[PDB]
Design an enzyme around this catalytic site. Structure first.
Site, PDB file in Angstrom:
ATOM      1  CG  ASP E  63      40.011  41.799  40.759  1.00  0.00           C
ATOM      2  OD1 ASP E  63      40.681  41.355  41.716  1.00  0.00           O
ATOM      3  OD2 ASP E  63      38.950  42.437  40.913  1.00  0.00           O
ATOM      4  CB  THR E  96      39.604  36.394  37.824  1.00  0.00           C
ATOM      5  OG1 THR E  96      40.089  37.619  38.389  1.00  0.00           O
ATOM      6  CG2 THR E  96      38.082  36.447  37.731  1.00  0.00           C
ATOM      7  CB  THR E  97      44.030  36.914  40.945  1.00  0.00           C
ATOM      8  OG1 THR E  97      45.459  36.937  41.051  1.00  0.00           O
ATOM      9  CG2 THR E  97      43.427  36.699  42.355  1.00  0.00           C
ATOM     10  CG  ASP E 402      35.147  41.610  41.376  1.00  0.00           C
ATOM     11  OD1 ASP E 402      34.495  41.094  40.444  1.00  0.00           O
ATOM     12  OD2 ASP E 402      36.237  42.195  41.198  1.00  0.00           O
TER      13      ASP E 402
HETATM   14  N1  LIG Z   1      42.780  39.755  55.280  1.00  0.00           N
HETATM   15  C1  LIG Z   1      43.263  38.622  54.712  1.00  0.00           C
HETATM   16  N2  LIG Z   1      44.088  37.797  55.392  1.00  0.00           N
HETATM   17  C2  LIG Z   1      44.580  36.668  54.848  1.00  0.00           C
HETATM   18  N3  LIG Z   1      44.292  36.273  53.595  1.00  0.00           N
HETATM   19  C3  LIG Z   1      43.478  37.003  52.795  1.00  0.00           C
HETATM   20  C4  LIG Z   1      42.905  38.248  53.324  1.00  0.00           C
HETATM   21  N4  LIG Z   1      42.145  38.767  52.341  1.00  0.00           N
HETATM   22  C5  LIG Z   1      42.222  37.933  51.272  1.00  0.00           C
HETATM   23  N5  LIG Z   1      43.018  36.880  51.546  1.00  0.00           N
HETATM   24  C6  LIG Z   1      43.333  35.766  50.616  1.00  0.00           C
HETATM   25  O1  LIG Z   1      43.450  36.234  49.268  1.00  0.00           O
HETATM   26  C7  LIG Z   1      42.913  35.259  48.369  1.00  0.00           C
HETATM   27  C8  LIG Z   1      42.299  35.912  47.136  1.00  0.00           C
HETATM   28  O2  LIG Z   1      41.747  37.185  47.474  1.00  0.00           O
HETATM   29  P1  LIG Z   1      40.716  37.955  46.503  1.00  0.00           P
HETATM   30  O3  LIG Z   1      39.848  38.855  47.350  1.00  0.00           O
HETATM   31  O4  LIG Z   1      40.087  36.965  45.553  1.00  0.00           O
HETATM   32  O5  LIG Z   1      41.708  38.882  45.638  1.00  0.00           O
HETATM   33  P2  LIG Z   1      41.189  39.641  44.317  1.00  0.00           P
HETATM   34  O6  LIG Z   1      40.087  40.542  44.822  1.00  0.00           O
HETATM   35  O7  LIG Z   1      42.414  40.370  43.817  1.00  0.00           O
HETATM   36  O8  LIG Z   1      40.717  38.531  43.407  1.00  0.00           O
HETATM   37  C9  LIG Z   1      41.903  34.449  49.171  1.00  0.00           C
HETATM   38  O9  LIG Z   1      42.028  33.055  48.867  1.00  0.00           O
HETATM   39  C10 LIG Z   1      42.216  34.732  50.630  1.00  0.00           C
HETATM   40  O10 LIG Z   1      42.627  33.543  51.313  1.00  0.00           O
END
Ligand SMILES: Nc1ncnc2c1ncn2[C@@H]1O[C@H](COP(=O)(O)OP(=O)(O)O)[C@@H](O)[C@H]1O
Ligand SMILES: Nc1ncnc2c1ncn2[C@@H]1O[C@H](COP(=O)(O)OP(=O)(O)O)[C@@H](O)[C@H]1O
Ligand SMILES: Nc1ncnc2c1ncn2[C@@H]1O[C@H](COP(=O)(O)OP(=O)(O)O)[C@@H](O)[C@H]1O
Ligand SMILES: [Mg+2]
Ligand SMILES: [Mg+2]
Ligand SMILES: [Mg+2]
Lengths: 48, 40, 548, 520, 546
Positions: E63, E96-97, E402
């Protein structure tokens, strides 16, 4: 950006003039006119 | 920049540039500095 | 405890000398050192390959997609990588084709050898494995060959030869680049059908002169040659037919000078008066002699005097400068003249035949043209190559050298002997070499097996550079060869290959109708020199360097 | 084993750049966009100029891609592609260099977002190389086969974006006469050689039917000769007319003292014999590349014979084609027929420098005008502006093709590309439409320098192509958009074809590159 | 970019002066320079990174919250994105990303609008009308939280927060863990409003078996060592009393003022005895109360340890303030800062003691932890993470931390929306038809605002090393028909996104990925407020330090 690292945004002309470290002495008189414009009315620093 | 040395022209750090309104004020005041010599 | 003894008896040699034995994973590091520049070559193999900015010491830049050319400028520290540089340099000098195959194959033989040495195979058995694979590889290349040229000059056959060669280096458009070479090859070849004479062809005959400006579509094929010269006396369009004559002199066209202390000597005024006009007369005489033969242009080999120039342009004789040996020799082959250093009368049999000599503006500078006509053909033709960027002129010029080098491949062997391209020649050897491993017993079978795995890089590279997923394109192509030769004759599964652009799945619609093939003579020496590159690197178990 | 250190073997030299990435290429695009930003505001007549001073303190003011880029030693490898196409465009056509550079830049920007997506490189190059083939064919349809009405209008547009555009009413009248002196199929550029004259005002220039060359030396008997000949006769020489060694050597043995007087008189005898042969043919003007001594010029000064020397070979070749004579490097082979003639002769004071004027010939191949101005950059800008305009009217005589200026060619080509893309797939579509809107950068910046808003302009161009079939473009005078055929603004098509071919070749060169190696 | 400008030509400033579009370009490259490290970390296909402190120490982080906080940037325009990453971690705790990539592209795509002579005031107005139109469309497209007979929601919510982590493959096991943890530590406040305090659960840095065999504790786990080794480690039996003290229990002096000055040396030993006796009188009454386990914030002297070893009491020193409030809240005790009452006498009542079923001290790889389970009044929970080393567990600690914030928001607000760039692609089709309605110059601002929103689904395909335009074109085709759905469910071609492991477009409801709508709301406003801050700057004035 100030000398002490304190970053600050400022659109008003009075606060812009305080942070500007001007070497010329006559140009520093505009700092105090904006203070008088700010102290009396509080609007139109830029205009003055 | 992206960390790499972003250079285009030879002797990058030596030469400068000037644009906008400040480039014009350097020109007119340079003429006034010469005009004061010739005016008297 | 605070400090080691720092390798005692190290004063036997100098401090700068270092040893590098097979232990300590250093042979794995040498394979990794090959892997650094080998991955650069992957992005440069095939029609979708990407050129490389290889700036050098001087600043002189070259942009390129050839393995042998790029490795000349890079100063290399690792000696095992220099084996690939000189191996590709040998490929460019002899055949002038298939240098990327040498780099990508010999690097992958060291890659799969990383697995073999880690398993515990001795280095002596590894060389015996690839040598026995090499004898079977070169044997089967002659067996699965299809097609032949059988005619030195043809409009449609040369499209099958030049087009797959230049498709790697600066693909662009196919027709405008291929027609410039096929037209120029027919001019220089001594056809002479139904005579029984031995064919002959020179790489130095076809030469490309770089001129800035214009576009690639405006490029023309010149019968003669061209230089960026200026006539001294006068310029002439030469609208007079009834062809002119040519006389070539290697010495400077001027008054004779001996060699040992040529100094005037005038004892009295009678010699002072005649010494000034004597010269005029003599030079004039030699020049008139030259002209009664009907010559109107003389190519000089060195600096020409002014007094000799005054009598040449009197009768309208053109003067041309060629201050070098090879520039003067290439011009005699066009008109077929025999130079003589004497300032006398040219022999009529030795006089050359050139119809017109034009001077026009191409690149903004003065150039002199020597276009011949259909009658009285000539050799050593040139190709006017127009372009915008000087760097692109350099790489396209070397593509003509690769195409001209491919034409050399038809003269020495009995014929063309074309092979199917687009990975079909590589993927077919994988099944044949894999079957060969099953027939032979012993511990060398794993060396034969990994030798087949190394040949997958050509279809894997063309699938990666084409913007496709190699995990789906590669095993889809194996299905054409896993359905092996049934009882019906005339099987057409050999022409299946990869595809850069188009249909899904990718088994190309044959390399056939597409008219892309490979040369047998390129594949023979490429696999030979690539195996020698892996042999010399794997056979050595200790390396010694100095000063670094 | 021979050392306790065992250094790890680096592949490349220390200080040899390593370059792998989806980026790397983005830095080359940003490097080209950086150079493209400097040449950005110099487009069109309402643009600006660029002042550069190199390390040797040589001042220069120019708006040409070429000069500006050159006065700049570009060390970046990918940025020198813009330098090559500018010199390639400047060497052949001599106009629209800037245009080519701005086109390249925009193609590169479009290429950038596309590369920020996996779209690979051969796919982007295939789009431009397939689209540029239709743009060349479309420009052939935009261009006309004009033959009626018998130069004047093409020169006014080539002089734009620099000094003499406002003085086009006076310079175009005599500039058209410069190329009409040249016949077909020769087109010699050295005959249009023009020199520098620091001092004067540009308005006082005049047209000359011949040559005007600086003497560059003050002779002892120069003032004695007349400055005005009614019927002069020109004869070009090459022999050195002075008392010196004859033929590259000097060694004379003399035994008797009586002959020592005769050998000296023989040298005085032959030198006047060399000069008397020049006098007997009636050559009033004498010219030679080599120097002329004080002995010869005083012999010519007595009997009203002008002479001059210290001139270059390029100047001598212009003298022959002006007078129509020939070169004679020997005084004995002089005949009356090879002497050139003109109407009159008059040496005039021009900027504290003397020039020998020839004019009034019945058939002159030469046009050479004296460029007078205040600063050394004024005379230089008048030279480059004329050198760019003279190439346009030169090649207009080679072929009669005329297309609409003011950014009208880019919009008409872009509309058909949008129609051609509306018929095809997905990948290629986005690419061709990206090439379409990227090709509109020429009218984009042409109006931004004028101070007008780009949205109101660009919305008016697209929806008004139906009645504005082909001659629809921008007009700066009335602050409106209308037909360019009524305004008599013309421009050839060769600038457009070479611009797209050079710009397509420039962007495709480094788009096939994802590496950067820099030794030392 | 090209060269440095003139330094105070007839202006007389001690620092540097720059103006025009050059600094506006430097802000774009500044936001893109800090955003490139965030590009590769987006989505499940993203890879982690490591930051070295030039002392050997390193930390793995995915993150962009703590990555940009550690990267010390000196350009002030980049500091706003650094603080934006820290701001989004406080309120929402996820995404945050995404705000760094969205805010950078809005400035990058708006850079073309600057040189078109469109003023920034008109550009942000076109962005803001697109924003409130996008929020209402997000408020229309949101779905209810039931969806079936069973819950079938909270297990799928954890997969979105758990994706793009080292333990994303083990999210099937950890999905049941996080939902069982936050449902145990709920509370009551504001007369019916349920709250979920994040970080209340104890995340222990254990080493051992694996992340798959991480045992969920049914109760709170205190991370502290035992005072003496001769004490009983395991205490069985029901109704184990918990005492939570904070007063100073070691021998300490009398207050500052008191200076013992003695004239009759006979009582010199007696004052020494009562100072040693007055501290033991407090320990005497705790034994009379019968507290099996006692916890103290301050230290514990050896004079007190002898009484706990004799009476078999578990005394633990070196507790922290924030932990003991959760022990008293879970076990049912009350925090005791000092022993006193409204009356003048001093005593201790049994009501101050808590209750729990079992207390066991466990040790695993040099990590002593007191496992308190079976709280009668209110439940508690703790998660014992297990991995390779401490620096790998820091990524797991941030991954779990998170996850609690995301599962917190879906329970506080039942409205959710699908992932995979669905709403980012849906707003483009909604804003294109709205961009033509408004007419004048704001069409380009609303249009380029919509084009910048597509960067989220594009980055999923670029990092996947696959063909991106085919997935975007197919996602564009289905969303294009959603606006023209022609209602009469048969309202299909909606709630679809990218499936990167297979490379197809499928239904995200069945795939089991969701995200709360409130995260989309705050991320868009905070990204646009950061975009407003950078666009409105014209000229920089950098003053050198004195
Ligand atoms: N299994 C999945 N399939 C498709 N898109 C996903 C999946 N998991 C996460 N995403 C996409 O990734 C984006 C950001 O993920 P996030 O969990 O916030 O990443 P991080 O934990 O690095 O912040 C989301 O907007 C979501 O649409
Ligand atoms: N258009 C095409 N379609 C399919 N295969 C091609 C195409 N162009 C080239 N190839 C294949 O790519 C290979 C590249 O060979 P390469 O080593 O680059 O030749 P060169 O020695 O000229 O560099 C060829 O052997 C050929 O079979
Ligand atoms: N009189 C004019 N009216 C409208 N446009 C013009 C006129 N003259 C030149 N232009 C435009 O200016 C552009 C640039 O031409 P020019 O100034 O000659 O060279 P450069 O490209 O070096 O600036 C052309 O594309 C042309 O359309
Ligand atoms: Mg080839
Ligand atoms: Mg121009
Ligand atoms: Mg998340």
């Amino acid at each position: 950006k100030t000398s002490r690292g304190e970053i600050i945004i400022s659109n008003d002309g009075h606060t812009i003039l305080k942070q500007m470290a001007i070497l010329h002495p006559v140009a520093r008189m505009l700092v105090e006119v904006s203070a008088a414009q700010d102290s009396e009315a509080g609007d139109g620093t830029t205009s003055v | 920049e992206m960390g790499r040395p972003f250079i285009i022209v030879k002797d990058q750090g030596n030469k400068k540039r000037q644009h906008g309104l400040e480039a014009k004020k350097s020109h007119i005041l340079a003429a006034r500095s010469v005009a004061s010599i010739i005016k008297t | 405890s605070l400090r080691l003894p720092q390798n005692p008896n190290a004063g036997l040699f100098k401090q700068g000398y270092n040893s590098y034995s097979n232990a300590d994973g250093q042979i794995i590091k040498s394979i990794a050192a090959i892997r650094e520049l080998h991955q650069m070559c992957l992005t440069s193999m095939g029609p979708c390959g990407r050129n490389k900015i290889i700036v050098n010491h001087l600043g002189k830049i070259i942009i390129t997609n050839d393995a042998a050319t790029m490795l000349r400028e890079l100063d290399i520290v690792h000696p095992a990588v220099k084996v690939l540089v000189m191996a590709t340099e040998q490929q460019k000098i002899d055949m002038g084709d298939g240098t990327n195959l040498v780099m990508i194959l010999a690097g992958e033989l060291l890659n799969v050898s990383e697995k073999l040495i880690s398993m515990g195979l001795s280095a002596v058995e590894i060389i015996q494995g690839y040598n026995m694979a090499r004898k079977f590889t070169l044997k089967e290349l002659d067996e699965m060959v299809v097609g032949e040229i059988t005619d030195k000059n043809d409009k449609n056959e040369l499209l099958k030869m030049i087009k797959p060669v230049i498709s790697s280096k600066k693909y662009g458009s196919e027709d405008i680049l291929s027609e410039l070479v096929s037209e120029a090859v027919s001019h220089v070849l001594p056809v002479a059908q139904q005579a029984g004479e031995i064919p002959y062809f020179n790489v130095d005959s076809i030469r490309v002169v770089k001129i800035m400006g214009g576009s690639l579509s405006n490029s023309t094929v010149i019968k003669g040659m061209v230089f960026n010269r200026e006539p001294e006396g006068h310029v002439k369009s030469l609208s007079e037919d009834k062809k002119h004559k040519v006389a070539v002199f290697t010495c400077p066209l001027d008054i004779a000078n001996t060699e040992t202390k040529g100094t005037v000597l005038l004892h009295n005024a009678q010699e002072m008066l005649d010494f000034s006009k004597g010269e005029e007369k003599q030079i004039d005489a030699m020049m008139k002699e030259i002209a009664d033969m009907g010559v109107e242009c003389i190519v000089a080999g060195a600096g020409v005097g002014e007094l000799a120039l005054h009598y040449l342009n009197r009768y309208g004789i053109l003067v041309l400068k060629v201050p070098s040996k090879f520039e003067l020799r290439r011009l005699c082959r066009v008109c077929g003249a025999t130079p003589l250093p004497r300032l006398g009368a040219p022999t009529p049999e030795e006089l050359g035949l050139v119809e017109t000599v034009k001077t026009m503006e191409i690149g903004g500078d003065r150039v002199t043209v020597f276009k011949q006509e259909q009658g009285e053909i000539s050799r050593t033709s040139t190709i006017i190559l127009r372009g915008a960027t000087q760097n692109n002129l350099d790489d396209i010029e070397r593509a003509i050298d690769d195409g001209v080098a491919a034409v050399k491949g038809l003269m020495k062997p009995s014929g063309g002997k074309l092979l199917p391209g687009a990975g079909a020649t590589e993927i077919e050897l994988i099944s044949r070499i894999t079957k060969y491993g099953e027939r032979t017993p012993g511990l060398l079978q794993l060396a034969i097996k990994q030798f087949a795995v190394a040949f997958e890089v050509v279809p894997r590279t063309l699938a990666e550079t084409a913007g496709l997923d190699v995990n789906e394109v590669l095993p889809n192509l194996y299905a054409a060869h896993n359905v092996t030769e049934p009882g019906a004759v005339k099987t057409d599964h050999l022409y299946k290959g990869v595809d850069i652009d188009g249909e899904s799945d990718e088994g190309v619609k044959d390399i056939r109708e597409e008219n892309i093939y490979d040369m047998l003579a390129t594949k023979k020496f490429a696999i030979n020199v690539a195996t020698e590159a892996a042999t010399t690197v794997l056979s050595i178990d200790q390396i010694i360097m100095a000063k670094k | 084993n021979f050392g306790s250190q065992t250094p790890t073997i680096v592949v490349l030299k220390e200080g040899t750049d390593a370059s792998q990435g989806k980026g790397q290429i983005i830095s080359n695009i940003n490097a080209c966009v950086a150079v493209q930003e400097a040449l950005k505001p110099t487009l069109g007549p309402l643009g600006s100029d660029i002042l550069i001073v190199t390390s040797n303190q040589k001042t220069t003011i120019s708006n040409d891609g070429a000069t500006i880029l050159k006065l700049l030693d570009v060390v970046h490898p990918a940025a020198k592609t813009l330098v090559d196409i500018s010199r390639a465009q400047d060497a052949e056509v001599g106009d629209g260099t800037t245009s080519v550079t701005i086109l390249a830049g925009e193609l590169m920007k479009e290429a950038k977002p596309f590369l920020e997506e996996g779209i690979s490189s051969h796919l982007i190059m295939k789009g431009y190389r397939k689209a540029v083939s239709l743009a060349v064919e479309k420009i052939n349809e935009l261009a006309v086969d004009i033959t009626s009405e018998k130069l004047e209008r093409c020169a006014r547009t080539a002089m734009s974006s620099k000094l003499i555009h406002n003085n086009a009413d006076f310079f175009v009248k005599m500039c058209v006469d410069a190329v009409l002196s040249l016949d077909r199929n020769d087109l010699d550029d050295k005959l249009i050689g023009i020199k520098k004259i620091p001092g004067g005002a540009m308005e006082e220039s005049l047209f000359i039917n011949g040559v005007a060359f600086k003497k560059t030396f003050s002779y002892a008997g120069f003032e004695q000769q007349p400055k005005k000949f009614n019927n002069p006769k020109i004869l070009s020489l090459n022999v050195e007319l002075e008392l010196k060694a004859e033929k590259d050597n000097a060694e004379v043995r003399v035994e008797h003292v009586e002959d020592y007087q005769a050998i000296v008189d023989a040298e005085w005898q032959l030198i006047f014999e060399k000069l008397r042969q020049v006098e007997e043919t009636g050559a009033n003007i004498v010219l030679s590349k080599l120097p002329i001594g004080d002995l010869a010029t005083q012999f010519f000064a007595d009997r009203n014979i002008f002479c001059a020397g210290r001139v270059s070979a390029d100047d001598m070749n212009r003298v022959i084609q002006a007078v129509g004579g020939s070169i004679q490097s020997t005084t004995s082979d002089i005949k009356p027929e090879h002497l050139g003639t003109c109407a009159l002769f008059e040496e005039m004071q021009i900027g504290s420098e003397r020039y020998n004027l020839f004019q009034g010939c019945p058939q002159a191949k030469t046009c050479t005008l004296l460029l007078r101005g205040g600063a050394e950059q004024v005379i230089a800008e008048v030279e480059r502006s004329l050198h760019d305009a003279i190439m346009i009217v030169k090649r207009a005589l080679q072929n009669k093709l005329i297309v609409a200026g003011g950014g009208a060619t880019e919009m008409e080509v872009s509309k058909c590309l949008r129609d051609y893309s509306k018929t095809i797939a997905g990948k290629q579509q986005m690419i061709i439409n990206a090439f379409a809107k990227a090709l509109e950068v020429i009218p984009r910046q042409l109006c931004e320098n004028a101070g007008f808003d780009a949205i109101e302009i660009l919305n008016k161009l697209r929806l008004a192509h139906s009645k504005g079939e082909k001659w629809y473009g921008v007009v700066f005078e009335t602050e409106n958009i209308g037909d360019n055929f009524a305004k008599f603004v013309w421009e050839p098509a060769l600038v457009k074809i070479n611009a797209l071919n050079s710009a397509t070749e420039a962007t495709n060169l480094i788009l096939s590159v994802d590496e950067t190696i820099t030794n030392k | 970019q090209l060269f440095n400008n003139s330094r105070s030509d007839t202006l007389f400033l001690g620092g540097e002066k720059i103006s025009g579009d050059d600094i506006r370009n430097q802000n774009v490259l500044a936001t893109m320079a800090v955003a490139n490290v965030v590009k590769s970390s987006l989505g499940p296909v993203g890879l982690d990174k490591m930051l070295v402190d030039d002392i050997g120490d390193f930390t793995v982080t995915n993150d962009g919250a703590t990555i940009l906080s550690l990267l010390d940037v000196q350009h002030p325009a980049g500091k706003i994105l650094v603080e934006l990453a820290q701001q989004q971690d406080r309120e929402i705790g996820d995404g945050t990303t995404s705000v760094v990539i969205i805010a950078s592209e809005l400035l990058k795509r708006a850079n073309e609008l600057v040189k078109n002579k469109i003023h920034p005031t008109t550009i942000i107005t076109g962005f803001r009308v697109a924003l409130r139109e996008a929020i209402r469309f997000i408020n229309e497209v949101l779905s209810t939280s039931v969806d079936t007979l069973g819950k079938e929601t909270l297990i799928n919510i954890a997969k979105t927060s758990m994706s793009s982590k080292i333990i994303g493959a083990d999210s099937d096991f950890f999905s049941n863990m996080v939902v069982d943890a936050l449902l145990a530590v709920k509370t009551q406040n504001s007369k019916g409003e349920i709250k979920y305090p994040v970080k209340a659960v104890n995340v222990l840095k254990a080493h051992g078996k694996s992340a798959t065999e991480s045992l969920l504790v049914p109760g709170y786990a205190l991370n502290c060592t035992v005072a003496s080794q001769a004490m009983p480690k395991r205490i069985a039996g029901g109704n184990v009393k918990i005492a939570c003290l904070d007063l100073n229990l070691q021998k300490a002096r009398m207050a500052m003022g008191v200076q013992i000055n003695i004239d009759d040396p006979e009582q010199l030993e007696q004052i020494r005895k009562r100072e040693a006796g007055i501290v033991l009188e407090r320990v005497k009454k705790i034994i009379d109360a019968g507290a099996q386990v006692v916890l103290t914030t301050k230290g514990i002297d050896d004079l007190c340890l002898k009484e706990f070893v004799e009476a078999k009491i578990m005394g633990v020193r070196r507790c922290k303030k924030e932990d003991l409030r959760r022990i008293a809240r879970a076990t049912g005790a009350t925090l005791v800062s000092s022993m006193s009452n409204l009356e003048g006498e001093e005593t201790f009542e049994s009501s101050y003691l808590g209750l729990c079923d079992e207390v066991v001290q466990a040790k695993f790889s040099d990590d002593e932890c007191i496992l308190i389970k079976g709280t009668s009044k209110h439940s508690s929970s703790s998660i014992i993470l297990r991995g390779a080393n401490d620096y790998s567990l820091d990524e797991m600690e941030r991954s779990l931390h998170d996850s609690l914030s995301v599962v917190k928001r879906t329970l506080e607000s039942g409205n959710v929306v699908p992932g995979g760039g669905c709403v980012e692609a849906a707003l483009n089709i909604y804003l294109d038809n709205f961009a033509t309605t408004v007419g004048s110059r704001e069409q380009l601002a609303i249009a380029e605002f919509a084009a910048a929103l597509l960067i989220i689904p594009k980055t999923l395909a670029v990092n996947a090393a696959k063909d991106s335009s085919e997935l975007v074109a197919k996602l564009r085709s289905y969303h294009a028909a959603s606006q023209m759905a022609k209602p009469e469910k048969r309202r299909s071609y909606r709630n679809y996104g990218l499936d990167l492991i297979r490379g197809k477009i499928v239904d995200e409801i069945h795939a089991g990925v969701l995200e709360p709508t409130i995260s989309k709301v705050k991320s868009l406003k905070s990204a646009l407020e950061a975009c407003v801050a950078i666009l409105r700057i014209d000229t920089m004035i950098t003053v050198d330090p004195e």
